[PDB]
Amino acid sequence: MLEARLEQASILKKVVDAIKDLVQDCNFDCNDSGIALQAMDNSHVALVSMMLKTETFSPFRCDRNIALGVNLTSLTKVLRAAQNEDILTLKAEDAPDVLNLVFESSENDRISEYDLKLMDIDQEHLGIPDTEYAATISMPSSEFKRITTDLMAMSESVNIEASKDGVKFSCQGDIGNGSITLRQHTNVDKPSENIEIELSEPVSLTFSLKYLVNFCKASALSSTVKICLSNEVPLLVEYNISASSYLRFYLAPKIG
Amino acid sequence: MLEARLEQASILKKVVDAIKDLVQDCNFDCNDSGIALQAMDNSHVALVSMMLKTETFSPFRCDRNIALGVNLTSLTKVLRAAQNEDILTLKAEDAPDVLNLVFESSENDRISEYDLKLMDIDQEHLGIPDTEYAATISMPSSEFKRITTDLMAMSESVNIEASKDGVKFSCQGDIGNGSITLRQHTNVDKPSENIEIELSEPVSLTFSLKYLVNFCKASALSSTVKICLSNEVPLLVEYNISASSYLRFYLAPKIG
Amino acid sequence: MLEARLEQASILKKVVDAIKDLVQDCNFDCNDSGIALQAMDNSHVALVSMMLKTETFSPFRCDRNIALGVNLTSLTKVLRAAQNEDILTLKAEDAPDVLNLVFESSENDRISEYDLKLMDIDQEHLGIPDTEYAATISMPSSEFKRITTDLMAMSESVNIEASKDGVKFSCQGDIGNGSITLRQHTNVDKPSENIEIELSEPVSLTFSLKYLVNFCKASALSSTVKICLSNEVPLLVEYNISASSYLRFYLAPKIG
Numbered sequence A, B, C: 001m002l003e004a005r006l007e008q009a010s011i012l013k014k015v016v017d018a019i020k021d022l023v024q025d026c027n028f029d030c031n032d033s034g035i036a037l038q039a040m041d042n043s044h045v046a047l048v049s050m051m052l053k054t055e056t057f058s059p060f061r062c063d064r065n066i067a068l069g070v071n072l073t074s075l076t077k078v079l080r081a082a083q084n085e086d087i088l089t090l091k092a093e094d095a096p097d098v099l100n101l102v103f104e105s106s107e108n109d110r111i112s113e114y115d116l117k118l119m120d121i122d123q124e125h126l127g128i129p130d131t132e133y134a135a136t137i138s139m140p141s142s143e144f145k146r147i148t149t150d151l152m153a154m155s156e157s158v159n160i161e162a163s164k165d166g167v168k169f170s171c172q173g174d175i176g177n178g179s180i181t182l183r184q185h186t187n188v189d190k191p192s193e194n195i196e197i198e199l200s201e202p203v204s205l206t207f208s209l210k211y212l213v214n215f216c217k218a219s220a221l222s223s224t225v226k227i228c229l230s231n232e233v234p235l236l237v238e239y240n241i242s243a244s245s246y247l248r249f250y251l252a253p254k255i256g
Helices: A010-017 A072-079 A141-152 A209-218 B010-017 B072-079 B141-152 B209-218 C010-017 C072-079 C141-152 C209-218
Strands: A002-006 A025-031 A034-040 A046-053 A060-062 A066-071 A087-092 A098-104 A111-117 A135-140 A157-162 A166-172 A176-183 A196-199 A203-208 A224-229 A235-239 A246-251 B002-006 B025-031 B034-040 B046-053 B060-062 B066-071 B087-092 B098-104 B111-117 B135-140 B157-162 B166-172 B176-183 B196-199 B203-208 B224-229 B235-239 B246-251 C002-006 C025-031 C034-040 C046-053 C060-062 C066-071 C087-092 C098-104 C111-117 C135-140 C157-162 C166-172 C176-183 C196-199 C203-208 C224-229 C235-239 C246-251
Touching (some): A010 A072, A034 A060, A046 A209, A072 B176, A141 A166, A141 A176, A141 A224, A203 A209, A209 A235, A209 A246, B002 B010, B010 B046, B034 B060, B066 B072, B072 B111, B072 C176, B141 B176, B141 B224, B157 B209, C002 C010, C010 C072, C034 C060, C046 C209, C135 C141, C157 C209, C157 C224, C203 C209, C209 C235, C209 C246
Antiparallel strands (some): A002 A087, A025 A066, A034 A046, A135 A196, A157 A166, A157 A203, A166 A176, A176 C111, B002 B087, B025 B034, B034 B046, B046 B246, B087 B098, B135 B196, B135 B224, B157 B166, B157 B203, B166 B176, B224 B235, C002 C060, C002 C087, C025 C034, C025 C066, C046 C246, C098 C111, C135 C224, C157 C166, C166 C176, C235 C246
8 A cells, every 4th residue: 555744735736736737647657656636737738747755755655656637736735724734644545436635733733645546557667768868958947937038939949059168048939039048056155056068079959948938847756857968869858856856858959 | 863883993994895885775783782784685686784782892882772773885985085094083963864874994094985875775684593503614714715706716516514524516518527525624723724514414515606606705704604504594694893792694595 | 339337127017017008009218318208198198208418327428319110018028127226228220120128137147138129109299398387296206196097986087286385186987086185294213204395386188187197107206296286287296317317107186
């Protein structure tokens, strides 16, 4: 059976909010190692890859594998009834018809309990191979959110060009051409504002801004976002929820 | 004639906002004792009962009975032009065609004056008899607002079960079953957060969440809300605006 | 060629936001003295008159006259990508196809650059003669915003009556009659709250509230607003962005 406690419901609330606009029906794959999610968005363009590792929970138990077929709009209805600082416990039996969710107030000793009906969802689960990326940009998540948000108003597409010195986001639109250039930047007393760029080779590729804006709905999960460009494989946009757990989005560059 | 001063327009603004989504056309019944309102909602399901007692005003005058036939969307248009800390004065002559409203700024000596046209509205005014309730729950208004709001997303109905120890809100929905359980709770240094439950006998009854959400639009009038359950008479949900005045909502439980 | 730096993008952002709901297609007339705008609203009722004088920029260069034909919804798309505290530089060559806009971050050394495509817009540029106004009311911009906003909910029209003592805004609506009366008011320790009224002769005239609400979208440009009434010429509603620069709106009173 499954039994998993988060100290703050916050983490799960943020996770689901970061996925639900891309994916409606998906499985949460529970086992020894934690709770994973792997699903394409509804248009079958982007791949969503979540791993909530056992260390993120406190405590965590999952004896046998359990696939929790969940509608995310249904789960969002439940999770909105959890406050961010509620102690959250997930429970599910072997061959579950429901996922049991318990939210416990910190002070006033309110206890909320929901039995969310599960459904039969077919898994796809593509193989995510190991990869050495051409360029990796680490920057504040709010800045990447603003960039994609600003350019989206102007264009459907953004060219991302990585160099040793910096990274340039470029687009052409009906109103004109635009670009936003960031270069490596370090603040001793505000290291959270740092922009760090590691380059093994030049990479200049074009991506859907609409998908990038949706990826930036994970901005609440982490202060920093890792943008990983490759000339061979899809872009990886990574939010590390903790030392262990991550929410990842994969997006292929646009090819004629 | 009528002449009634509130120190802060706030009280009246909050009152009307707490009623206008339920009732459009209603009478304000003015006399010696203050200003009352008694009207069913537009679907004729819930009863709204307001009493602004003479002690709430400063000063208060009403020589003879005057029924002020008012459209609440029209009055809302006027009251939005009063700031919360405006000194508010209501005036009306015998056999009035208009209600006169005067809002006086605290500092900058702005004076606003409106003559709201009255209309012919037929009164119903049901007899509200005296009643010994099976269970009375006193809790913070924000908590009851959150509860009803959260469950509304999931269900049209909520079962409220009162015991000595606690109170359970339960519902069944398309997405599953849910419940929120509160028990008696007292904080010495934050007594405003206290949950107090007085029970003469067990009561478990089902009510419309949509009506309860609308009742919770009075949450600004008082930090505390009194929920009064009976096996004989409709539920009473009470907001005490001051020691004297109250806004009350009555709702019959659902019966097959 | 044109080259003009603002210390804070804020000024330009606020300016364009204050005009775009009235005017879509307009010219920015650049020369020695600064950057001007003069255009009627889309219904050809109100006249918009902006002057950003050379002293407002730091530094400013414009060798020859350049008319920058701009769509304001297109420019708004660009300016939303400038943060309020960005150093903003406008550039344009002689016979320009584009306006070049550069936004430079204060700390993290982000640089944004846009080439906004210009268009062929015919100028009207009416003669704005010099005028001695019957009454001039100087008051806080937020108060005028609130007044027009409040009365708009009730009426399409507002009568503005100026006297030595004070100014009265009056309207008749379907819900009734309303008025807001301000008188001369001075606070030694909060002079920004002051209401000052200078009268050479009585003036009582009626104006469109819808136009006045739109004029109040310039409220962010200045803490104080100057309302200038005349029995001969259109009302002038003036926002002084700095000692030099201004955004002005002209509106003729309603005549049968």
